Amino acid sequence: MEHVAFGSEDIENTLAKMDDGQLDGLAFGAIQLDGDGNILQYNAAEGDITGRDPKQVIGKNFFKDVAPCTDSPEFYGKFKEGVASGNLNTMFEYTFDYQMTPTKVKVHMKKALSGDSYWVFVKRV
């Protein structure tokens, strides 16, 4: 298990060093997303939380294909402002309900160190 805390101010430097099986060590959900919303990385914890198979969802689009309930102004809309402005750090609660038992989570979107990448982190509430 890799010792990083959900919500750490410097999270993005830390994860920068982390490869896929290292990201599978985290204590929480972790998705890395391009500027358009396509899934580049996806850890086991998010698999555990949502039912999804990590390796299959890489390549698909989070908002269009994977998770339509986040296609809304309260979530996607947040993401799209971020990417456009070139900065995103926000935290909120939300309920994922698509093709699953509804699960309330805490959600943290934050811009990765790397060029045009963006992090989506998640844990149960």
UniProtKB/Swiss-Prot annotation:
Positions carrying S-(4-hydroxycinnamyl)cysteine: C69
Keyword field: Chromophore, Photoreceptor protein, Receptor, Sensory transduction
Example GO molecular function: photoreceptor activity
GO terms (BP aspect): phototransduction; regulation of DNA-templated transcription
PAS domain mapped to chain residues: 23-86
SMART domains assigned to the protein according to its UniProt record, in alphabetical order: PAS
PTM per Swiss-Prot/TrEMBL: The 4-hydroxycinnamic acid (p-coumaric acid) chromophore is covalently bound via a thioester linkage.
InterPro entries: PAS, PAS-like_dom_sf, PAS_fold, PYP
Subunit composition and interactions: Monomer.
Record-stated family: Belongs to the photoactive yellow protein family.
Protein name: Photoactive yellow protein
The species this protein was found in: Halorhodospira halophila
Organism lineage: Bacteria, Pseudomonadati, Pseudomonadota, Gammaproteobacteria, Chromatiales
Gene name of the encoded protein: pyp
